[PDB]
Curated annotation (Swiss-Prot):
The chain holds residues 1 to 70 of 685 of the full protein. The gene is UBC. Disulfide bonds: none annotated. It is found in: Cytoplasm; Nucleus; Mitochondrion outer membrane. It comes from Homo sapiens. Residues 1-70 form the Ubiquitin-like domain. The lineage of its organism: Eukaryota, Metazoa, Chordata, Craniata, Vertebrata. This is Ubiquitin. The modification Phosphoserine is found at S65. The record marks R54 as: Interacts with activating enzyme.
Amino acid sequence: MQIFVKTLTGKTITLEVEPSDTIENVKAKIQDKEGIPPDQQRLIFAGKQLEDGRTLSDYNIQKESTLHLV
Ligand SMILES: [Zn+2]
Ligand SMILES: [Zn+2]
């Protein structure tokens, strides 16, 4: 699945992921993309605060879903 992550500046990061990727995995991908350390990252999808050890499917994140770094 393709997802979008919007940075604090509104920059778009396009990520290739799998339903079962954890939020931890996503944070490492964001690190590689923009150099933001994972401890510095806080993610939201549809107003839910996302936990590192849960998966994209766990939050009903889907193809073309947008996430926000907050
Ligand atoms: Zn895909
Ligand atoms: Zn993965």
